[PDB]
Design a protein around this ligand. Structure first.
Ligand SMILES: [O-]
Ligand SMILES: [Zn+2]
Ligand SMILES: [Zn+2]
Length: 240
């Protein structure tokens, strides 16, 4: 008989759900966190977003696996119970696109950088259903991003990967750097095996310039931070 809203519940603090963690960042915006078990070592965390936009939900990034992504969808059903209209996934690595099959089975329309949709299938991953094309200035061509609501998608240039994209949430102070940006105390940029080391620093800067009003920077592999994360990341990336 105690029936708080999800917002009221998330005041208590971050919530464990199955093998995931959820955190409310602002009303109508939650961070999902999933973990890749690496035998003998600590599990690798990855963050994405869930946005309630009127009577629908929008997702940024899958979890590492289909099952973890199904757990995200279970949380949305239990706590929000609105249809998930679409998902945007932010490059062709496992932490961002490892759960595409779960999204597709749920009837969710999926979008990724056209380049991610080329890169993913040859890695044994599944492409998104729709491809985003970006103008030379980095902004998504609106015709390729129909019905995105508050999501503003920006290609900052090659960095963490050649295909990495970023997402601002209009009406909030939040911008999602995905795996491009690490927090202002990070001692490394993580696995740079697919990175463009020449352009990384400039791409981090371009993300900051694209979303100048975003005071909360959300990231895949760090907890949310203030804007100092952006220049810290660019400093770490300088002259790799
Ligand atoms: O990643
Ligand atoms: Zn990555
Ligand atoms: Zn990542």
């Amino acid at each position: 008989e105690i029936r708080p809203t999800i917002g009221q519940q998330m005041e208590t603090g971050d919530q464990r759900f199955g093998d995931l963690v959820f955190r409310q960042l602002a009303p109508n915006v939650w961070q999902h966190t999933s973990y890749l078990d690496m035998p003998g070592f600590g599990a690798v965390a990855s963050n994405g977003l869930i946005v309630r936009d009127g009577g629908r939900v929008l997702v940024v990034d899958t979890a590492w696996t289909d099952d973890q992504t199904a757990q995200i969808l279970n949380w949305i059903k239990q706590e929000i119970n609105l249809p998930v209209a679409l998902a945007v996934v932010t490059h062709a690595h496992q932490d961002k696109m490892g759960g595409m099959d779960a999204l597709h089975a749920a009837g969710i329309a999926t979008y990724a950088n056209a380049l991610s949709n080329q890169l993913a299938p040859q890695e044994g991953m599944v492409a998104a259903q729709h491809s985003l094309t970006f103008a030379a200035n980095g902004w998504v061509e609106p015709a390729t991003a129909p019905n995105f609501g508050p999501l503003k998608v920006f290609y900052p240039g090659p960095g963490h990967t050649s295909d990495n994209i970023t997402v601002g949430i209009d009406g909030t102070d939040i911008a999602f750097g995905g795996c491009l940006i690490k927090d202002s105390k990070a001692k490394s940029l993580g696995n740079l095996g697919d990175a463009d080391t020449e352009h990384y620093a400039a791409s981090a800067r371009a993300f900051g310039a694209a979303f100048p009003k975003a005071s909360m920077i959300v990231m895949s592999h760090s907890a949310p931070d203030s804007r100092a994360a952006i220049t810290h990341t660019a400093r770490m990336a300088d002259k790799l």
